[PDB]
Amino acid sequence: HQPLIARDGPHPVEQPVHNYMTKVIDRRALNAAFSLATEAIALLTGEAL
Amino acid sequence: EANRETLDELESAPQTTRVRADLVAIGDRLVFLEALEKRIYAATNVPYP
């Protein structure tokens, strides 16, 4: 909302104003890599135990 | 009576609030030091006179 200050002639007569915007969301992502190894899989699995 | 009680002087002081404003001592006299274009002339299109 924008205000008024009432002026005199010969300055034109301004009116109240109203402003409406709506912004759109912008989306992204992140990444990280955990990679394991083979002989490590057999252990945790319980196999080679 | 050469010097009368002046009619312009017989009013009681109005009620007074406590307002925030800068007061600067220049020479011997206090002065409101004021720049309006924040309070007024802000976010309207009226130029600052």
Which among A2, A7, A14 has the least Cβ separation from residue B43? Answer: A2
Q: Is B39 an 8 Å CB contact of chain A?
A: no
Q: Is A2 an 8 Å CB contact of chain B?
A: yes
Q: Do residues B37 and B46 touch, judged by C-beta distance below 8 A?
A: no
Phi, psi dihedral angles at B26 (to 5 degrees): -120, 120
* Neighbouring-strand partners of residue B26: B29
Which residue in B16, B11, B33 sits closest to B24, CA to CA?
B33
Residue carrying structure tokens 């009576």: B1
Closest CA in chain A for residue B40: A5
List A residues 4-23 in contact with B (Cβ-Cβ < 8 A).
4-5, 7, 14
Other C-beta atoms closer than 10 Å to the C-beta of B5 total: 8
Reading the block at residue B34, the tokens are 């004021």
CA B7 to chain centre: 23
| Cα first-last separation, chain A | 72
| Cα first-last separation, chain B | 47
Q: Return d(Cα A18, Cα A36) in angstroms, integer.
A: 59
Radius of gyration for chain A, computed over Cα atoms and rounded to the nearest angstrom: 33
Other C-beta atoms closer than 10 Å to the C-beta of B25 total: 8
For residue A26, the distance in angstroms to the closest alpha carbon of chain B comes to: 29
The resolution in Å comes to: 3.8
